[PDB]
RNA sequence: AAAAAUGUUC
RNA sequence: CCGAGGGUAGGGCCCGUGACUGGGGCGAAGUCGUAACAAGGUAGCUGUACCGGAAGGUGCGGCUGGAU
RNA sequence: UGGGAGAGGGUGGUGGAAUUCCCGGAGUAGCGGUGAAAUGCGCAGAUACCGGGAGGAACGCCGAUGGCGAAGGCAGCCACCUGGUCCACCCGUGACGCUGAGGCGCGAAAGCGUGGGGAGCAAACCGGAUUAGAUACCCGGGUAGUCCACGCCCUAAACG
RNA sequence: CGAUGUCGGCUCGUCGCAUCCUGGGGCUGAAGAAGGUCCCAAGGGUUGGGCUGUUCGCCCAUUAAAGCGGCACGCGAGCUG
RNA sequence: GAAUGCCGGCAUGAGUAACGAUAAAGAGGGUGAGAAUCCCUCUCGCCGUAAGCCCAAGGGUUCCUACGCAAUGGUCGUCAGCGUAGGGUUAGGCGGGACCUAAGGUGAAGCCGAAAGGCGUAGCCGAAGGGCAGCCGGUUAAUAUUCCGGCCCUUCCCGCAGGUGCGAUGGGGGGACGCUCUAGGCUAGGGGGACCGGAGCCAUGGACGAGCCCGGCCAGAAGCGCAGGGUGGGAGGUAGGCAAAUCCGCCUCCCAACAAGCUCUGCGUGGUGGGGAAGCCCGGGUGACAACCCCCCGAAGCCAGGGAGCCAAGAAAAGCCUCUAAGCACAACCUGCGGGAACCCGUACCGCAAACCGACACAGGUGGGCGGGUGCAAGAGCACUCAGGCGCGCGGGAGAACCCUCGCCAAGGAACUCUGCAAGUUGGCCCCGUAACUUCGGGAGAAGGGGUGCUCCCUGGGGUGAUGAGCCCCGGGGAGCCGCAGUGAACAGGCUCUGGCGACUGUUUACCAAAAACACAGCUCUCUGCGAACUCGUAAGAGGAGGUAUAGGGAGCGACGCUUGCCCGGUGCCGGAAGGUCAAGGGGAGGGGUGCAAGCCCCGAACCGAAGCCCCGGUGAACGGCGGCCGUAACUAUAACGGUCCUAAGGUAGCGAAAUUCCUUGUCGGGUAAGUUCCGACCUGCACGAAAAGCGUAACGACCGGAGCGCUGUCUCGGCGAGGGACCCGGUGAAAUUGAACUGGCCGUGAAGAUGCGGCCUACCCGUGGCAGGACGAAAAGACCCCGUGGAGCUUUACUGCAGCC
RNA sequence: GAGCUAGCCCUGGCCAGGGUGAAGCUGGGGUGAGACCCAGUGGAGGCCCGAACCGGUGGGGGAUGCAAACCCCUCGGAUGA
């Protein structure tokens, strides 16, 4: 339920903020926060290798559990639901009856104080983590591993979710958020339910400064540079692309596919993405 | 206005100092060449 | 289950 | 002190007029097509939407004020 | 008070038929289409037939000249929440009634916003015909939209 | 071409005369007035404004008249730009 | 003898410009060979959120003294940041190290690279971050939280006593965190006092006064008081914190719950130690047995790790506490007391600057803290002023032009000009008042207007305190006084209407462009299934991202509103197990060389054989493209209409002489006296047009236009005045430039613009202040143009390679 | 060679004073319940004015400079990209 502002500045008429209604706790768990080494988009050589990065708000990285098979059968309580600056989703704080405390990303519907568990025998219930094979066909899942015991890699962004469309051997057929149809291993864990905070995509950043708070530095069009800089550089006055629209490095950027043709996971993609 | 020389002893020693020179093949040659010339100062003098 | 328009004036 | 009024400034209503522009009305026998009236030759009409020299056409739904 | 009838309304769920796309088999020179054709599709293996799958939308028979709602309108099936309504007994209240400028709410379709969704259908648009022309009818495509959520719009041959 | 700074304006003038005005004439299809035209004449004078960078030009209001040219299309070791 | 030659020396310009902020000087006395310039005193002026003070960096003896004045000092010099000599920097507590980590760097393990080297987990290093013990005063010519005095504290070592399962680099807690706003109580700092202390003063008309002037504190251990921060207690279970755990984490139960208790800071008090002015006398002494008190104002600082709200969600690690592990429980640890022990480095001086960065004693640049008083609504603003520091290291005169900076101006009032450039105007606060339009915020400080000082009188509420006095803070009403003028000085919007462009705040060519350019939220296309795409790297390894399609890359467009048409023939891209072409390779008909030969060797056809291209389709918010000619209407005119040729399709909505219109100052209309501009229209649009977006759009703009009001020295049209220069004198004394010069006008001539030739004319010798027409004046071996088989940046369907990719 | 300059990383510091007055909260009104209306409180913002500070708009001076980019007047941002 994105929060609109009255137009009391130029930028406030479009600026919407998250409603933060599901958050129950406004300070991370100490035993779970490490410093997030900000990069500015620069590699170990020092070079900018992803452009227009930096200067965003300081952050603390919250350790998330993408391996909920680590604590099979040990139930846990949903202690809180918390903010996380490092992802689009909300993170849930779990008190395992072990006395172990872990963070997980918060699926939609998950209510503070409910019990969740992980394992083959888990109820098909919001926030439980079963191997893909033990989840019934037609179930909406998120935080899906892509290879057994390697960590939840799919459907972790706000509102995302994969769907189990059918089975075939040691593999189940998943419809990823992208609309791709993939074979993911049945022993791969997923968490039933979609990720919470669907409204995340309806947030209107509002002004340039907001983007800078996200660590996003200004983006310079190729069309505005000189021929030393960019295939779209130069021209007298404004100028159209004048060639197949291209990246700063020469390659075409309109339709040109770039997935490795001989990639071994091709055997596991049923149907390239939709739309 | 602000000019180019903004002296800083720590900077001077970490950039042009004897130890910085010896750490890289170029710096070693630098010292080598200044010794062969007979410089009185292989590295800049800075007080620490 | 219709091929095919139009028509000077009191 | 108030005070005719005069002055400076800013408003509201009304009227006349204005390059040009929009349709409207009318104008015995102009130009294009033939939409409607017979099932008017694709039944019509309708609110709406898009489109087309133009009447109109088409979609969606509605009405019979439709033939057999 | 005790009963009844009903596509009344909202939410969630769920069932089968059909169209489409995909996958497998099998299979050959046409298919499709019309007034007749052409466009289109098809030996790069279409159509037709079988199995599997994905998806969305609409509910055949019952079905009616029937039912319900104030109207717009409402049709598979299940449950939940809920409105109106008729009937019997003649129990209670004791005119508390009727209408209603404003106000408020509802309000088919189409349209609009933000999302989702998208099979079939289909304004716009394309192409094939027809034709003097054919910015139409008829044909092969096809985008909005049609569907869902929320919010607008507030129109009508909103008619008995 | 081991540099002669380019239009326009401003400022300062100075010269020419194919004279715009002013002085003097002849001819007139010169009645007068006022014109026309040619001749002599460079002494002095030759306005303020709107438009446009403009020169020029058009226009407004005047004027005796609102001359045309040369001076490195006079004049940036004077200014503007 | 020439090379804008090289080096040096010395000329010229020239006693010329200049002598570095216009804050400012004058006199007396001293010193001395010599004095505007040094010392002293008096007077005067300037800074005072500094031009004062204290830190940090940088500098490196510049510090203090004694003796000096050749050079340095833009003059002088007896002075000095200068020459010589001597002296000066004193710490367990300040700063840094013997503590901790941040980025980063480095790096046992490990990985990679022709070599050199590149990486890399831990670890180590790495500070202005964390952590940690000293405050006040005195002293030196020069150092002082450093020496001294007072009063305190830290750790290390040993011992004594008491208490305890002690013990760690291991577990855990804590350390530990943002931004804005902010409570209470304090302190720093300040104001006043009719109270306390003080040497005095009574002037020039008055005042012996509740007069004036001056000062009225500082540090402090325990205890105590005030204010705050931190913190539940117990029990039972336990599978988690990579061993263990009595700790922490999880569940239960009893009690406690604004508390209290325990603890830690702040502040006050506090034994005690200090300080202590004006004035006078020569840094000192007196004052002085100085007093040291009350009220108010009051932090941004302190209690603090306080509170609230927000979204962008806000280091680490040690110290410290706790838990247990080896071990050890004669130990060890904890607490208390005692004695001993406590190292290396810095410490001078400048430090918004004459000592640092700018070649200079350079009007520039340089982080942190303090920064007093009064008045002005507030403040670090502005004026003045304290403390303190300065008058800027050439002076003296004169009183021209001209220039700078400044003041004023009759009448006019933009007539100036490319343009109101510039300069006026406006100007704070309080009150009244405020339009189109609008996205309902705005526009808005719209516009416009009134008010503003001082005196007296009455009264309202606030803080403090006590509920009162006093002080202090917001006001309200009535009556008056004066001036040209009351925000009387200083600081402080001119305004309106209307287009263009860009939504907006932002960004930019450091040093000629701040814009309409870039950016921007937002929109679309596109790539990307995660060992992602993409980027950097030979690689390793990184970035992407400790992210996962609501995400990440690329590209265009650029808030928002309304929209974004038709062309897929070409080019791109995407799809297409057929067909065609196609390399290596396979294949090996068939030839060939050779040899007595077995054989060895070469050639080699069909045929199989990738991507790519061909080919078939799709695709425009991919590259892009969106016609011609002729005719036709009951007037002319013009064509809704037709004919035909071509196209892949022929430019739709909207807009249009435009940031686009050649002709052009188009035509018409508005505004003006007059309008190549401007605004509104028209539309035969040379050559708009729909995300290189089309058309609009409130708000915003040091953008660019047009108009009006206000006001002006912009101007008609200049005048006067000020100061700093220019001028004279004393001091010091450059520069570019310079073939040599004894360097005139005209008309000619001359390589075509002559001081230099001819002819004529003019002209005594030499300067000074001035002006710039000439010396084709200076400066820069023309930056335009061409030339060179010179160079470089950039492009591509130029050529040819290479990376990368298939 | 990043002691200038450009970006980023880490860790610190700075931003006088005044103006406007968003959400929310409270109370009242409102209704079947609502939306909502109002008042008070609240203190939001690449909000407003304006020092420090960061700038560098227009003009003037400067031009062998005080300065190889300075000075004066003016002007932009000043809780934020
Ligand atoms: Mg909003
Ligand atoms: Mg609103
Ligand atoms: Mg939330
Ligand atoms: Mg931690
Ligand atoms: Mg990272
Ligand atoms: Mg590195
Ligand atoms: Mg390196
Ligand atoms: Mg990159
Ligand atoms: Mg970057
Ligand atoms: Mg989050
Ligand atoms: Mg994310
Ligand atoms: Mg798998
Ligand atoms: Mg978005
Ligand atoms: Mg961020
Ligand atoms: Mg951009
Ligand atoms: Mg460019
Ligand atoms: Mg460019
Ligand atoms: Mg480059
Ligand atoms: Mg290149
Ligand atoms: Mg290029
Ligand atoms: Mg280009
Ligand atoms: Mg260019
Ligand atoms: Mg360009
Ligand atoms: Mg162009
Ligand atoms: Mg360009
Ligand atoms: Mg290209
Ligand atoms: Mg895919
Ligand atoms: Mg600089
Ligand atoms: Mg230098
Ligand atoms: Mg610096
Ligand atoms: Mg340093
Ligand atoms: Mg350094
Ligand atoms: Mg540095
Ligand atoms: Mg070094
Ligand atoms: Mg280095
Ligand atoms: Mg080497
Ligand atoms: Mg070596
Ligand atoms: Mg040397
Ligand atoms: Mg030596
Ligand atoms: Mg060296
Ligand atoms: Mg028919
Ligand atoms: Mg006809
Ligand atoms: Mg007839
Ligand atoms: Mg009156
Ligand atoms: Mg009168
Ligand atoms: Mg008809
Ligand atoms: Mg019909
Ligand atoms: Mg049609
Ligand atoms: Mg075929
Ligand atoms: Mg075949
Ligand atoms: Mg589908
Ligand atoms: Mg009925
Ligand atoms: Mg009864
Ligand atoms: Mg409706
Ligand atoms: Mg509808
Ligand atoms: Mg009916
Ligand atoms: Mg030349
Ligand atoms: Mg020369
Ligand atoms: Mg020259
Ligand atoms: Mg010259
Ligand atoms: Mg010359
Ligand atoms: Mg020229
Ligand atoms: Mg003039
Ligand atoms: Mg005459
Ligand atoms: Mg006559
Ligand atoms: Mg004359
Ligand atoms: Mg002309
Ligand atoms: Mg002209
Ligand atoms: Mg006359
Ligand atoms: Mg002339
Ligand atoms: Mg001539
Ligand atoms: Mg000239
Ligand atoms: Mg000429
Ligand atoms: Mg000419
Ligand atoms: Mg000339
Ligand atoms: Mg000239
Ligand atoms: Mg000039
Ligand atoms: Mg000129
Ligand atoms: Mg000259
Ligand atoms: Mg001259
Ligand atoms: Mg010679
Ligand atoms: Mg020379
Ligand atoms: Mg030479
Ligand atoms: Mg030489
Ligand atoms: Mg010599
Ligand atoms: Mg010499
Ligand atoms: Mg001389
Ligand atoms: Mg001389
Ligand atoms: Mg002289
Ligand atoms: Mg001279
Ligand atoms: Mg000079
Ligand atoms: Mg000088
Ligand atoms: Mg000077
Ligand atoms: Mg000054
Ligand atoms: Mg002054
Ligand atoms: Mg004197
Ligand atoms: Mg002297
Ligand atoms: Mg002397
Ligand atoms: Mg003195
Ligand atoms: Mg005196
Ligand atoms: Mg002061
Ligand atoms: Mg030095
Ligand atoms: Mg000397
Ligand atoms: Mg001497
Ligand atoms: Mg000597
Ligand atoms: Mg000297
Ligand atoms: Mg001297
Ligand atoms: Mg000097
Ligand atoms: Mg001397
Ligand atoms: Mg002497
Ligand atoms: Mg000393
Ligand atoms: Mg000590
Ligand atoms: Mg030691
Ligand atoms: Mg360390
Ligand atoms: Mg090495
Ligand atoms: Mg280091
Ligand atoms: Mg430290
Ligand atoms: Mg310390
Ligand atoms: Mg102390
Ligand atoms: Mg103990
Ligand atoms: Mg213990
Ligand atoms: Mg913490
Ligand atoms: Mg933290
Ligand atoms: Mg910290
Ligand atoms: Mg104190
Ligand atoms: Mg005070
Ligand atoms: Mg005390
Ligand atoms: Mg407890
Ligand atoms: Mg346990
Ligand atoms: Mg403390
Ligand atoms: Mg502060
Ligand atoms: Mg604090
Ligand atoms: Mg707090
Ligand atoms: Mg915030
Ligand atoms: Mg760390
Ligand atoms: Mg023992
Ligand atoms: Mg030691
Ligand atoms: Mg010291
Ligand atoms: Mg300064
Ligand atoms: Mg400072
Ligand atoms: Mg100094
Ligand atoms: Mg100083
Ligand atoms: Mg020096
Ligand atoms: Mg310099
Ligand atoms: Mg000086
Ligand atoms: Mg200086
Ligand atoms: Mg004071
Ligand atoms: Mg004030
Ligand atoms: Mg002076
Ligand atoms: Mg000064
Ligand atoms: Mg001076
Ligand atoms: Mg004189
Ligand atoms: Mg004289
Ligand atoms: Mg001055
Ligand atoms: Mg006067
Ligand atoms: Mg005047
Ligand atoms: Mg006037
Ligand atoms: Mg006027
Ligand atoms: Mg004017
Ligand atoms: Mg201009
Ligand atoms: Mg103008
Ligand atoms: Mg209004
Ligand atoms: Mg208006
Ligand atoms: Mg407007
Ligand atoms: Mg409004
Ligand atoms: Mg106001
Ligand atoms: Mg006003
Ligand atoms: Mg007075
Ligand atoms: Mg003012
Ligand atoms: Mg102002
Ligand atoms: Mg215009
Ligand atoms: Mg711009
Ligand atoms: Mg802008
Ligand atoms: Mg816009
Ligand atoms: Mg923008
Ligand atoms: Mg920048
Ligand atoms: Mg520039
Ligand atoms: Mg430049
Ligand atoms: Mg430059
Ligand atoms: Mg430069
Ligand atoms: Mg400039
Ligand atoms: Mg600007
Ligand atoms: Mg730019
Ligand atoms: Mg958009
Ligand atoms: Mg690369
Ligand atoms: Mg990686
Ligand atoms: Mg990472
Ligand atoms: Mg842009
Ligand atoms: Mg095409
Ligand atoms: Mg194509
Ligand atoms: Mg095609
Ligand atoms: Mg192939
Ligand atoms: Mg294009
Ligand atoms: Mg093209
Ligand atoms: Mg083309
Ligand atoms: Mg259209
Ligand atoms: Mg036009
Ligand atoms: Mg025009
Ligand atoms: Mg236009
Ligand atoms: Mg054009
Ligand atoms: Mg034109
Ligand atoms: Mg023209
Ligand atoms: Mg005209
Ligand atoms: Mg116009
Ligand atoms: Mg025309
Ligand atoms: Mg384009
Ligand atoms: Mg264009
Ligand atoms: Mg609008
Ligand atoms: Mg606008
Ligand atoms: Mg702007
Ligand atoms: Mg701006
Ligand atoms: Mg601007
Ligand atoms: Mg003047
Ligand atoms: Mg004077
Ligand atoms: Mg004399
Ligand atoms: Mg002299
Ligand atoms: Mg001298
Ligand atoms: Mg001679
Ligand atoms: Mg002469
Ligand atoms: Mg001569
Ligand atoms: Mg000649
Ligand atoms: Mg001559
Ligand atoms: Mg001769
Ligand atoms: Mg001669
Ligand atoms: Mg002569
Ligand atoms: Mg002289
Ligand atoms: Mg002179
Ligand atoms: Mg001259
Ligand atoms: Mg010459
Ligand atoms: Mg000349
Ligand atoms: Mg000359
Ligand atoms: Mg000249
Ligand atoms: Mg030059
Ligand atoms: Mg040369
Ligand atoms: Mg040359
Ligand atoms: Mg040159
Ligand atoms: Mg040229
Ligand atoms: Mg040439
Ligand atoms: Mg050649
Ligand atoms: Mg060449
Ligand atoms: Mg080259
Ligand atoms: Mg290569
Ligand atoms: Mg590629
Ligand atoms: Mg730097
Ligand atoms: Mg530096
Ligand atoms: Mg630096
Ligand atoms: Mg600030
Ligand atoms: Mg106010
Ligand atoms: Mg308020
Ligand atoms: Mg609140
Ligand atoms: Mg602001
Ligand atoms: Mg304001
Ligand atoms: Mg300037
Ligand atoms: Mg100059
Ligand atoms: Mg210069
Ligand atoms: Mg300045
Ligand atoms: Mg100023
Ligand atoms: Mg700003
Ligand atoms: Mg401001
Ligand atoms: Mg401020």
Closest CA to A115 of A138, A96, A135, A143: A96
Residue A171 Cα, ligand 150 centroid: separation in angstroms? 86
The spacing between the Cα labelled CA in B33 and the C1' in G549, in angstroms, equals 59
Contact (Cβ atoms closer than 8 angstroms) between residue A91 and residue A64: yes
Candidates A40, A14, A19; CA nearest to A210 is: A14
A190 DSSP β-pair partners: A130
The spacing between the Cα labelled CA in A138 and the C1' in E75, in angstroms, equals 29
Across all strands, nucleotide nearest A154 (CA–C1') = G548
Rg (CA), chain A: 22
A4's enclosing H/E stretch is: strand A3-4
Tokens for A14? 């479009």
d(CA A150, CA A62): 19
Burial category of A257 from C-beta neighbours within 10 Å (exposed 0-12, middle 13-18, buried 19 and up)? exposed
Strand partners, A263: none
CA separation for the pair A94, A116 (Å, rounded)? 9
Q: Do A40 and A61 contact (CB within 8 A), yes or no?
A: no
H or E stretch at B13: helix B9-16
Query: CA of A3 and C1' of H42: distance in angstroms?
Result: 19
Residue A223 has which token pair? Answer: 């069309």
Protein CA A30 to sugar C1' G569 (Å): 68
Q: Give the residues across from A35 on adjacent strands.
A: A60
Which nt has its C1' nearest the CA of A58? G314
* Residue A16 C-alpha from the chain's centroid: 20
Spacing, Cα A43 to ligand 186 middle (Å):
10
Measure A228 CA to G789 C1' (Å): 29
Tokens of A57: 């708000």
| Buried-exposed string A123-136: b where 16+ CB fall within 10 A, e elsewhere | eeebbbbbbbbbbe
Nearest to A75 by CA among A94, A47, A48: A94
Q: What is the Cα–Cα distance from A103 to A113, expressed in whole angstroms?
A: 14
Resolution of the experimental structure, in angstroms: 2.8
Q: The tokens of A83 are what?
A: 């903010």
Backbone φ, ψ for residue A269 (5° rounding): -100, 115
Ligand 179 centroid, distance to B3 Cα (angstroms): 14
Is the shortest CB-to-strand distance from A227 to strand E under 7 Å?
no
Give the CA-to-C1' distance from A208 to G776 in angstroms: 62
Calculate how far, in angstroms, residue B48's C-alpha sits from the geometric centre of ligand 118: 21
Percentage helix, strand, coil for chain A under 3-state DSSP, each rounded to 5: 10, 30, 60
Q: Which long-range contacts (CB under 8 A, 24 or more apart) does A10-19 make?
A: A10/A207, A11/A206, A11/A207, A11/A209, A11/A210, A12/A206, A14/A204, A14/A206, A14/A207, A15/A204, A15/A205, A15/A206, A15/A207, A15/A210, A16/A202, A16/A203, A16/A204, A16/A206, A17/A203, A18/A197, A18/A199, A18/A200, A18/A203, A19/A199
List bases in chain E with any atom under 7 Å of a protein Cβ.
22, 53-55, 114-116, 118
For A268, counting Cβ atoms within 10 Å of its Cβ (0-12 exposed, 13-18 middle, 19+ buried), the class is middle
Q: CA nearest A84: which of A126, A13, A2, A25?
A: A25
Q: Pick the closest to residue A210 from A2, A55, A50, A28 (CA basis).
A: A55
For residue A199, which nucleotide's C1' is closest to its Cα? Answer: G550
- Using the mean position of ligand 20's atoms as its centre, give its distance from the Cα of residue A45 in Å: 25
Structure tokens at A199: 């409204």
* Structure letter (DSSP) for residue A138: T
Alpha-carbon distance of A41 to A252, in angstroms, equals 23
Name the CA radius of gyration of chain B, rounded. 12
Phi and psi dihedrals of A149, rounded to 5? 65, 20
Q: How many degrees, rounded to 5, is the angle at CA A19 between CA A57 and CA A94?
A: 80
Nearest to A137 by CA among A192, A208, A57: A192
């Amino acid at each position: 339920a994105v929060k609109k502002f009255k137009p009391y500045t130029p930028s406030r008429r479009f600026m919407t903020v998250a409603d933060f209604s599901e958050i129950t706790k406004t300070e991370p768990e100490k035993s779970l926060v490490k410093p997030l080494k900000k990069t500015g988009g620069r590699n170990n050589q020092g070079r900018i290798t992803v452009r227009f990065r930096g200067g965003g708000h300081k952050r603390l990285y919250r350790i998330i559990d993408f391996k909920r098979w680590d604590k099979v059968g040990i139930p846990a309580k949903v202690a809180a639901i918390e903010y996380d600056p490092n992802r689009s989703a909300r993170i849930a704080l779990l008190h395992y009856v072990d006395g172990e405390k872990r963070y997980i990303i918060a699926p939609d519907g998950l209510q503070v104080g409910q019990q969740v568990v992980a394992g083959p025998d888990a109820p098909i219930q919001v926030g439980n983590a079963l191997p893909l094979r033990f989840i019934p066909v037609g179930t909406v899942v998120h935080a899906v591993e892509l290879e057994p015991k390697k960590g939840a890699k799919l459907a972790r962004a706000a509102g995302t979710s994969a769907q189990i469309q059918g089975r075939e051997g040691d593999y189940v057929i998943l419809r990823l958020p992208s609309g791709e149809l993939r074979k993911v291993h049945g022993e791969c864990y997923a968490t039933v339910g979609a990720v919470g905070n669907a409204d995340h995509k309806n947030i209107v950043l509002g002004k340039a400064g907001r983007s800078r708070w996200l660590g996003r530095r200004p983006h310079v069009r190729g069309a505005a540079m000189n021929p030393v800089d960019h295939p779209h550089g130069g021209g007298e006055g404004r100028a159209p692309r004048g060639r197949p629209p291209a990246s700063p490095w020469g390659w075409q950027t309109k339709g040109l596919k770039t997935r490795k043709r001989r990639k071994p996971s091709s055997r596991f993609i049923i149907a390239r993405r939709k739309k | 206005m602000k000019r180019t020389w903004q002296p800083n002893r720590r900077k001077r020693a970490k950039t042009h100092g004897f130890r910085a020179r010896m750490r890289t093949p170029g710096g070693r040659k630098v010292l080598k060449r200044r010794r062969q010339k007979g410089r009185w100062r292989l590295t800049p003098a800075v007080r620490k």
